[PDB]
């Protein structure tokens, strides 16, 4: 019923009297019934971490033991809202205390218990066989995610007897009964979920959908795949939220959990007072992204407990929103400072350190949560299929890449997006170092490419081949004179340096570059290819490009302005466009080269 | 004074040549090495302790 | 025959075994029993949790009547009240026939291709006695890899164990299923391939059992998947499940297998990771201080034996941490083996494949191998010509980029072209391509006319005069 408390030293409290405690669970201690997680059995005691502060116990205070291990409420009413770490919904607890610190050991439901939701019976009736993972109703929850489908929680089987017609329910309703060996089973609106157990799933499947961004340099030369994994630098100066605001605003997917696993704190208000401030764009000026994300926020001084269980709650959430059918991608914040939290339990704990102090279980814990990505066929009745993506950000760790989680991830993930501080402050935006970022699904999208843009592969690898010749030819200009060269490499040389400025920058602050959408690049690179090739071919059958450029014109002019045209009005219009540009680029060639 | 001013831009382009190509390194690692040896000795220390 | 007829009919035997509801504690991933009725180092037990899900465990250490069992499939959910175990009263046993080939099991050796039990010829222990030694007789023969960089400047001959250490994103898949594919005895590729692969993503195990499916060799393999979400502990079972079905099929049927494993990497690091779970002392940079013969019990289970005719080659893939050499894991692995194949970064980042160097690899048997009435008699020293010769291209390079190109006499201006072409053309292959030794060498030769005959001093002269010409 209840085990009094032995002895108290630090976090660590030892009860007694406990028989029949998992190894791990969760456990009410204390009249203030703080919350805990049973460590070490021996006969009766039963060593037990507090995550909150453990000042004030005294000996003989009851203890109480829940049943489970940590889990998640999953249910209706997550999107817009922010939980903590351990899923602590702090838009409530600042409504029930009506102070602005967090109260120790105040406790309310994950979910609020008193909304009405119009749910609206599935295909199943009593009388049928049903198992875990079906569908059997649904519920309307904003205009924007229009249809949360409700799942029999899995692990759970048997004949439905009672089902109750559509109407206006609360979550502490029952609205589904299931005999497997009596009629003693009864399911609300919501379940729980342990969070270190993925969730099961019927099959794993291969990525071969792009994840679309809007920023030509990613769409273009390092693309991602739905489904895929990726990191990138966590600095200052470089600035990783021009990244996660496009991603949030215009990305291809259904949901966004945005994870933050311990950050300065005002650096966190600069973030919370920004995302209910975002507006997509279809059907009109839809309402903010709030309406489609949910949060997670860790500040430094939370408990270190939860600050390393944050990873595996936004995951979690991210698999139940791929269960039913969706296209998530979740965006983690500087994973290293989650290794740090790490570091930090285990050695209260006390074991042996590994290189640098890290334990051993650095190597294979990440590689086992980064296994829950990609894409998958959902176990259930209408046969759903969706997907995870994570999208990291390493944080150098001092201010290097030596230490051991970054080189653990660098070999896990499969794509790296770099960012360098001296592009960005010298007016260059998105500030990408396109010599030392890389992407591994490029050979893996043809099936996609060849079936919609078959000329893409050829494209990227001639403007990559550009880009490098340009650089060569730039480490030897400074010594040898620009005059050394002939006009084949000062061709290449101007062309490289029109891709520079007017392709890979992108403005980012108006309508003609915030978005560009794939045929809006594909059409760019073709005229830029377009370009290079009829210019340096004048060269080759004799001419000189002193001649060239002049004679050209508003050949220079016109790709440069291809940017221009708003991708709002029509792909038909900018693909007429651009036709009838290189129509005019190819007769002027026939013209200036008579 | 062309023929002083090759030679010594060739010594001195010589010297900065040799620096940086088998100079820096060197030294860059045997920094990494005594580094590696620091925390070689730490982990015997703590284990020690623990014992 | 009656000998056959005798040996399992102690088969029909039914021995019942105990149930202990009594536990008496849990930290990490070990387990504490009580009043237990003579136990037995190393068995094996069957916990019962309260849920209802069956687990598996090994005992470790046994005192008066205690016995401290570590579970494989984690410990968490374990009750003190109402678990239960169940003493087997025997090691761990794994089920073998010859009908094995053309299966796929999981790290724990149970069958994942819908398919059902294996329904043995007999049982065998993972672990197994070492091999006489006055019982066994090296190798004295080749196999063609089709690999210009394995089959002329190294070698193998089967029986042998060569690992192949290769960096963090370099392709050794690629390689070794190169290899599998297309490795035969020098004049049959009826080599029965067993695969182990442990700590692996789902991407490297669809691309495995891809290959193996289109070259019509998937009808003659085993292969054993242990990817990196399964539990931890049973990454230390998996190789020896695959090399305890390798010795049946070879030292019992007499057919000549080949056996790889995909990551020794993480085999150290769930060594590490068990150990660290214990308080056992540490060796360098805290891999556990036994390592080496823990290593040696798995690598030294190749070769061939007096009275039989199978004989197992292993090619147990490695990465190394930082491209250390000095990594306790390569060294030891080195240490234990003979010869071992390299895997080059700088050679990647010129898009050369297969990306090996040749001055850091080595093969100990090849001296023996190659010689008269397999190859020509030059093999043995236009090997050593050649390793001369790269190894001059290396330095003269080296000091082209310091002193300028003022000092290069005309020793290293042939020497840097050398070193050009014997990459750009020799090294390099495709992904596709045989190359018989004979062609091999006659490509090696075509690459020493650069040299003038009166400096090619490591080769022997009589060699010279009768193919220098030619």
Same mark, same amino acid.
């Given at each position: ?6 002895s ?34 021996d ?13 004030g ?41 009506q ?48 249809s ?17 017609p ?41 990525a ?33 939220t021009?990244?996660?605001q ?13 994870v ?18 975002l507006?997509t ?42 269960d ?12 290293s ?69 970054t ?20 007016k260059?935006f ?28 050829v ?30 490499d ?40 377009s370009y ?8 080759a ?8 450029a ?11 302005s ?17 036709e ?10 026939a013209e200036?080269?008579? | 004074?062309?023929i ?15 620096? *940086?190509?088998?100079?820096?390194? =060197?030294? !860059? ?6 580094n590696? *040896?620091?925390?070689?000795?730490? =982990?015997? !220390? ?5 014992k | ?7 399992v009919?102690?088969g ?90 053309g ?76 290899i ?6 020098v ?31 998937l ?55 068990v ?95 190659i ?31 310091v ?68």
């Amino acid at each position: 019923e209840y085990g009094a408390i032995y002895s108290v030293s630090g976090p660590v409290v030892i009860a007694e009297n406990m028989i029949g405690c998992a190894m791990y669970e969760l456990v009410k201690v204390g009249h203030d019934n703080l919350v805990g997680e049973v460590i070490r059995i021996d006969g009766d005691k039963a060593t037990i971490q507090v995550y909150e502060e453990t000042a004030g116990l005294t000996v003989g205070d009851p203890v109480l033991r829940t049943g489970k291990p940590l889990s998640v409420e999953l249910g209706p009413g997550l999107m817009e809202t922010i939980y903590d770490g351990i899923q602590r919904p702090l838009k409530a607890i600042k409504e029930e205390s009506q102070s602005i610190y967090i109260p120790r050991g105040i406790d309310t439901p994950a979910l609020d218990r008193t909304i009405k939701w119009q749910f609206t019976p599935g295909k199943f009736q009593v009388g049928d066989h049903i198992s875990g993972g079906d569908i059997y109703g649904s519920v309307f929850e904003n205009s924007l995610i229009s249809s949360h489908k409700i799942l029999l929680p899995p692990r759970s089987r048997g004949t439905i007897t009672w089902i109750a017609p559509a109407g206006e329910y609360t979550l502490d309703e029952k609205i589904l009964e299931v005999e497997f060996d009596g009629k003693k089973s009864d399911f609300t609106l919501y379940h729980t979920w342990p969070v270190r157990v993925p969730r099961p799933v019927t099959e794993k499947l291969s990525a071969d959908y792009p994840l679309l961004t809007g920023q030509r340099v990613l769409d273009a030369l390092f693309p991602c795949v739905q489904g895929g994994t990726t990191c990138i630098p966590g600095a200052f100066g470089c600035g990783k939220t021009v990244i996660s605001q496009s991603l949030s605003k215009y990305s291809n997917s259904d949901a966004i959990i945005y994870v933050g696993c311990g950050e300065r704190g005002n650096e966190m208000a600069e973030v919370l007072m920004e995302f209910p401030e975002l507006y997509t764009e279809m059907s009109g000026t839809k309402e903010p992204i709030m309406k489609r994300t949910t949060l997670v926020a860790n500040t430094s001084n939370m408990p270190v407990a939860a600050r390393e269980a944050s990873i595996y709650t936004g995951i979690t959430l991210a698999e139940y929103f791929r269960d039913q059918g969706k296209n998530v991608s979740m965006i983690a914040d500087s994973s290293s400072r989650w290794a740090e939290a790490l570091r930090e339990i285990s050695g209260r704990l006390g074991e042996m350190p590994a290189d640098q102090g890290f334990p051993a279980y650095l190597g294979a814990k990440l590689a086992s949560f980064y296994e829950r990505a990609g894409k998958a066929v959902a176990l259930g009745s209408p046969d759903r299929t969706g997907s995870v993506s994570i999208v990291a950000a390493v944080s150098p760790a001092g201010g290097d890449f030596s230490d051991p989680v970054t080189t653990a991830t660098l070999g896990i993930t499969q794509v790296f997006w770099g960012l360098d501080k001296k592009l960005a402050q010298r007016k260059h935006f998105p500030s990408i170092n396109t010599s030392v970022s890389y992407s591994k699904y490029t050979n893996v999208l043809n099936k996609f490419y060849d079936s919609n843009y078959p000329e893409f592969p050829v494209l990227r690898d001639r403007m990559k081949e550009i880009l490098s010749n340009a650089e060569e030819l730039e480490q030897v200009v400074q010594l040898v004179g620009k005059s050394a060269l002939s006009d084949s490499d000062k061709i290449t040389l101007d062309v490289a340096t029109l891709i520079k400025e007017d392709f890979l920058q992108q403005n980012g602050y108006s309508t003609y570059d915030a978005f560009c959408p794939i045929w809006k690049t594909f059409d760019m690179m073709r005229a830029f290819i377009s370009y290079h090739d009829e210019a340096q071919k004048a060269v080759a059958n004799g001419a000189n490009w002193s001649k060239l450029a002049d004679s050209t014109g508003d050949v220079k002019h016109a790709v440069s302005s291809s940017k221009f045209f708003e991708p709002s009005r029509g792909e038909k219009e900018v693909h007429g466009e651009f036709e009838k540009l290189l129509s005019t680029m190819q007769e002027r060639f026939a013209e200036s080269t008579d | 004074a062309f023929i002083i001013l090759d030679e010594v831009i060739k010594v001195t382009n010589r010297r900065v040549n040799a620096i *940086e190509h088998v100079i820096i390194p =060197r030294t !860059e690692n045997t920094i990494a090495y005594i580094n590696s *040896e620091l925390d070689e000795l730490d =982990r015997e !220390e703590f284990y020690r302790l623990k014992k | 025959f009656a000998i056959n007829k005798k040996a399992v009919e102690q088969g029909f035997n039914v021995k019942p075994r105990l149930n202990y509801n009594t536990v008496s504690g849990v930290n990490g991933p070990l387990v504490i029993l009580e009043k237990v009725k003579f136990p037995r180092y190393n068995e094996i037990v069957n916990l019962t949790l309260p849920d209802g899900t069956v687990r598996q465990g090994q005992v470790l250490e046994i005192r008066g009547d205690r016995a401290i069992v570590q579970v494989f499939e984690g410990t968490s959910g374990i009750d003190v009240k109402k678990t239960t175990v169940e003493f087997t009263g025997e090691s761990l046993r794994i089920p073998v026939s010859e009908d094995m080939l053309g299966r796929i099991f999981d790290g724990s050796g149970r069958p994942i291709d819908n398919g059902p039990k294996v329904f043995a010829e007999d049982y065998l222990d993972i672990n197994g006695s070492p091999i006489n030694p006055y019982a066994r007789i090296y190798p004295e023969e080749m196999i063609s890899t089709g690999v210009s960089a394995i089959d002329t400047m190294n070698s193998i001959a089967r029986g042998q164990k060569i690992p192949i250490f290769s960096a963090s994103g370099l392709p050794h898949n690629e390689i070794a299923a190169q290899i599998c594919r297309q490795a035969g005895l020098v004049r049959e590729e009826n080599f029965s391939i067993v695969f182990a692969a442990m700590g692996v993503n789902l991407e490297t195990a669809r691309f495995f059992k891809q290959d193996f499916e289109e070259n019509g060799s998937l009808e003659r393999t085993s292969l054993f998947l242990n990817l990196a979400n399964d539990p931890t502990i049973e990454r230390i079972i998996t190789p020896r499940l695959a090399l305890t079905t390798a010795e049946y099929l070879a030292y019992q049927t007499e057919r000549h297998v080949l056996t790889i494993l995909t990551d020794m990497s993480s085999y150290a690091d769930a060594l590490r990771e068990v150990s660290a779970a214990r308080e056992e002392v540490p060796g360098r940079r805290g891999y556990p201080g036994y390592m080496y013969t823990d290593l040696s019990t798995i690598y030294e289970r190749a070769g061939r034996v007096e009275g039989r005719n199978g004989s197992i080659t292993q090619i147990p893939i490695l990465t190394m941490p930082n491209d250390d050499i000095t990594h306790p894991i390569p060294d030891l692995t080195g240490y234990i083996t003979e010869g071992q194949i390299f895997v080059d970064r700088q050679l990647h980042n010129k898009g050369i494949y297969p990306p090996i160097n040749v001055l850091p690899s080595l093969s100990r048997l090849m001296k023996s191998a190659i010689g008269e009435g397999m190859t020509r008699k030059d093999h043995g020293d236009v090997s050593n010509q050649l390793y001369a010769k790269y190894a001059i291209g290396k330095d003269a390079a080296a000091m082209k980029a310091v002193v300028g190109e003022e000092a290069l006499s005309i020793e290293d201006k042939l020497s840097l072209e050398f070193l050009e072409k014997f990459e750009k053309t020799f090294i390099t292959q495709g992904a596709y391509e045989d190359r018989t030794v004979f062609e091999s060498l006659d490509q090696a030769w075509s690459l020493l006319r650069i040299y003038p005959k009166e400096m090619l001093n490591r080769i022997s002269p009589k060699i010279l005069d009768e193919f220098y010409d030619r």
